[PDB]
Amino acid sequence: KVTTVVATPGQGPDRPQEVSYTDTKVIGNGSFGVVYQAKLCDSGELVAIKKVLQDKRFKNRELQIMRKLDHCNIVRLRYFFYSSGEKKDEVYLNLVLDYVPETVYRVARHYSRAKQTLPVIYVKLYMYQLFRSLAYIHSFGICHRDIKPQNLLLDPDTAVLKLCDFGSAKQLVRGEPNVSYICSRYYRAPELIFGATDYTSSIDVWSAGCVLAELLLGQPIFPGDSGVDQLVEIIKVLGTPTREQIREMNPNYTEFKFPQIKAHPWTKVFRPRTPPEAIALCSRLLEYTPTARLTPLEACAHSFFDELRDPNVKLPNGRDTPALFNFTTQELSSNPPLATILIPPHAR
Amino acid sequence: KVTTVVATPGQGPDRPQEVSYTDTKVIGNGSFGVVYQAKLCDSGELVAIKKVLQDKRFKNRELQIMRKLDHCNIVRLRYFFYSSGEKKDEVYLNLVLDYVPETVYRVARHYSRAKQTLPVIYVKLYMYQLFRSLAYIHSFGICHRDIKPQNLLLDPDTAVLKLCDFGSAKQLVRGEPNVSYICSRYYRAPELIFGATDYTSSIDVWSAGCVLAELLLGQPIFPGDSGVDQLVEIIKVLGTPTREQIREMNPNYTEFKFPQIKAHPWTKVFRPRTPPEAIALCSRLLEYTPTARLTPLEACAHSFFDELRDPNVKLPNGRDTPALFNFTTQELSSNPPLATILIPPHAR
Numbered sequence: 198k199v200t201t202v203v204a205t206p207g208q209g210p211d212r213p214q215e216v217s218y219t220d221t222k223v224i225g226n227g228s229f230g231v232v233y234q235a236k237l238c239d240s241g242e243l244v245a246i247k248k249v250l251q252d253k254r255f256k257n258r259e260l261q262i263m264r265k266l267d268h269c270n271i272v273r274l275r276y277f278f279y280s281s282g283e284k285k286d287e288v289y290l291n292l293v294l295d296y297v298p299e300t301v302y303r304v305a306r307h308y309s310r311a312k313q314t315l316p317v318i319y320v321k322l323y324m325y326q327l328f329r330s331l332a333y334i335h336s337f338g339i340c341h342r343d344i345k346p347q348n349l350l351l352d353p354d355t356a357v358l359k360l361c362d363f364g365s366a367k368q369l370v371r372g373e374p375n376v377s378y379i380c381s382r383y384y385r386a387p388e389l390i391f392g393a394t395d396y397t398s399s400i401d402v403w404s405a406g407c408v409l410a411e412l413l414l415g416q417p418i419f420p421g422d423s424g425v426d427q428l429v430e431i432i433k434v435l436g437t438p439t440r441e442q443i444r445e446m447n448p449n450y451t452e453f454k455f456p457q458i459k460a461h462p463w464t465k466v467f468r469p470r471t472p473p474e475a476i477a478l479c480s481r482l483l484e485y486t487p488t489a490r491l492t493p494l495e496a497c498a499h500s501f502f503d504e505l506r507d508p509n510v511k512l513p514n515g516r517d518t519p520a521l522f523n524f525t526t527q528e529l530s531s532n533p534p535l536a537t538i539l540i541p542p543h544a545r
Numbered sequence: 546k547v548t549t550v551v552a553t554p555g556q557g558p559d560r561p562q563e564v565s566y567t568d569t570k571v572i573g574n575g576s577f578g579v580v581y582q583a584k585l586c587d588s589g590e591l592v593a594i595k596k597v598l599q600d601k602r603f604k605n606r607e608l609q610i611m612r613k614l615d616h617c618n619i620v621r622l623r624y625f626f627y628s629s630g631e632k633k634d635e636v637y638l639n640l641v642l643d644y645v646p647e648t649v650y651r652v653a654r655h656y657s658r659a660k661q662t663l664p665v666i667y668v669k670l671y672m673y674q675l676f677r678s679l680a681y682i683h684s685f686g687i688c689h690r691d692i693k694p695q696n697l698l699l700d701p702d703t704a705v706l707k708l709c710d711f712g713s714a715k716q717l718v719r720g721e722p723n724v725s726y727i728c729s730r731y732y733r734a735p736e737l738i739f740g741a742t743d744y745t746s747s748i749d750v751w752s753a754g755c756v757l758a759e760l761l762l763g764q765p766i767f768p769g770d771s772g773v774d775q776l777v778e779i780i781k782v783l784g785t786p787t788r789e790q791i792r793e794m795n796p797n798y799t800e801f802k803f804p805q806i807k808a809h810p811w812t813k814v815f816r817p818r819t820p821p822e823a824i825a826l827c828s829r830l831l832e833y834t835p836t837a838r839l840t841p842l843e844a845c846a847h848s849f850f851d852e853l854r855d856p857n858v859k860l861p862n863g864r865d866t867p868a869l870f871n872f873t874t875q876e877l878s879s880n881p882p883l884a885t886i887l888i889p890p891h892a893r
């Protein structure tokens with residue numbers, strides 16, 4: 198009922214601490230392992246405890262990444278500790294994360310059952326914060342590789358979004374291959390569908406574009422149970438990829454024949470009330486050619502998010518906007534001059 | 546109510562004729578298009594009509610393949626015709642197939658939802674016929690590439706199984722590249738998960754192995770929404786692949802690290818009392834090394850199907866089994882001496 202473990206502070210001094218927690222229950226299963234909710238005894242603060250198999254023979258990459266990340270739009274690591282668990286003779290890594298009450302997946306499914314779509318102000322807020330989180334991790338060469346609604350945590354009251362799951366995350370290095378089989382069905386970049394191993398951080402931009410399109414639409418834009426089926430849905434919207442485009446995605450694939458279809462114009466993909474700036478942003482995210490896609494920071498600076506930089510912007514609930522403009526040098530490092538757009542006059 | 550088209554027979558002279566049908570209704574969707582049931586006015590016979598967009602550029606390969614195939618365990622293409630459809634000025638190919646009332650998918654789910662398993666006699670009947678269809682197409686060098694319960698049709702009362710959807714099927718040629726992104730989630734050989742463009746007909750055997758497993762087990766054996774999750778599940782059963790096994794699947798993956806995990810003995814994967822020869826056949830289909838997997842024809846000859854060769858065997862409904870032993874020469878061509886096992890005494 199009250200459990201006590203010795204744990205290391207996620208960030209801060211490397212000094213072990215006694216940590217007591219109660220009201221423990223399973224909130225999720227998965228290929229990774231188990232997620233638990235619990236309450237810290239000292240503070241009363243809720244946490245989420247992600248428990249995963251530890252590879253006995255090399256240090257855990259997820260832990261390593263999560264210990265260097267510090268950002269308002271990434272879920273915080275409070276503590277970690279090793280333990281035994283279900284399977285015999287295994288050591289488990291336990292990541293003690295700040296609890297967050299909702300996910301983008303769950304909110305999006307709430308409006309879908311009400312035959313409604315998320316109000317656009319929320320879509321700007323959440324997508325803006327996702328892009329800021331990607332700008333941050335990308336500035337360290339870290340690619341998330343599994344951007345999807347389930348991994349986007351929301352606090353509905355504050356409209357703050359936090360990026361979870363660094364279980365697939367990896368620092369990408371040019372000339373060093375990467376497994377092609379990361380990323381979840383609907384959110385996978387074409388280069389990944391094509392089994393590329395030399396892909397870039399722009400795979401997260403594609404994933405992010407799929408999420409935005411999906412919030413606008415009320416359903417996934419590129420569904421399918423096979424790669425073929427996904428490609429067809431992609432080709433239906435984007436049109437047939439040229440050979441030049443294919444060579445940039447996976448050069449092994451340039452001589453394959455593809456379904457011959459004309460690009461279905463973007464304005465008719467989305468609902469009539471969809472804002473045209475949103476449609477423009479989707480088109481600049483969901484590009485075949487990886488380097489033609491907006492960077493996260495450029496995405497942040499897109500006109501769709503202008504309403505966020507309006508000093509007179511309020512949320513529906515009445516509350517002010519969360520922190521959107523406290524950008525660090527690290528965050529801006531890919532394109533410092535973009536600060537002139539991203540940090541509006543009323544915040545300098 | 547009555548629709549009249551000009552259609553060409555699936556087989557025989559390219560002689561377009563008037564074909565009238567009625568009692569038209571939708572029984573399916575997909576990336577491909579839509580599926581209809583209908584009734585042929587002349588004969589009263591039921592058909593399914595697969596409607597798909599046509600490429601005025603290049604020939605339809607699905608059509609080409611289905612015109613050539615003649616086999617008791619492959620759905621017969623009765624007619625094809627061109628039409629107007631969804632997109633305004635676009636040409637649709639309509640494949641008119643023999644109606645079959647059920648699928649393995651539906652049957653398996655019926656049982657699944659009731660927390661029961663298919664009786665093994667039915668697992669024998671269906672999997673044997675599946676392997677027979679595979680031996681036949683493979684003998685022409687044609688790989689299906691999308692084996693899964695939804696593509697397996699059956700008549701409940703005769704117990705006959707027929708293999709549908711040749712939309713992904715291709716004649717494979719060694720050393721010539723193929724798209725890796727075919728085959729539906731759960732049924733995909735690990736070489737496809739690794740994005741191999743170089744692969745063989747043995748991907749169908751892996752898939753078939755996944756169907757056998759799924760019917761014994763009551764759920765898919767390697768679920769997951771990412772390739773990584775699929776692979777975790779695979780390794781938990783098969784154990785970590787050796788460097789050599791990896792090289793046989795995709796040599797570009799040899800230098801990546803994999804979870805160090807011990808094989809789960811195969812007997813403890815399935816519920817107790819699961820026939821041991823069902824388990825043995827599974828272990829010879831679901832092999833990392835693609836060349837180590839049984840051929841379809843070897844699969845048919847496996848002891849798991851001995852009961853089918855019994856002169857006294859009957860279906861549960863009391864009728865005789867369908868025709869299981871009337872092999873052609875083409876069918877036996879991969880390994881003709883296997884006829885000794887495959888055609889039992891009472892059938893010669």
Ligand SMILES: N#C[C@@H](Cc1nc2nc(NC3CCCCC3)nc(N)n2n1)C(N)=O
Binds near residue numbers: 295299300363
């Ligand atoms: N575990 C885990 C996720 C990240 C995650 N998921 C969370 N869910 C929550 N809360 C849930 C929101 C969904 C509704 C029930 C609790 N809180 C946190 N910190 N995380 N963090 C992963 N796969 O890495």
Ligand SMILES: N#C[C@@H](Cc1nc2nc(NC3CCCCC3)nc(N)n2n1)C(N)=O
Binds near residue numbers: 642645651711
């Ligand atoms: N079209 C199509 C499927 C094959 C297919 N599916 C069928 N379903 C039926 N009948 C349904 C099966 C069970 C559900 C009711 C009707 N009949 C036929 N001939 N086919 N043929 C494909 N993806 O190519």
Ligand SMILES: [Cl-]
Binds near residue numbers: 871873
């Ligand atoms: Cl035959």
Ligand SMILES: [Cl-]
Binds near residue numbers: 652667701
């Ligand atoms: Cl049945």
Ligand code: NA
Binds near residue numbers: 743744793794
């Ligand atoms: Na090979």
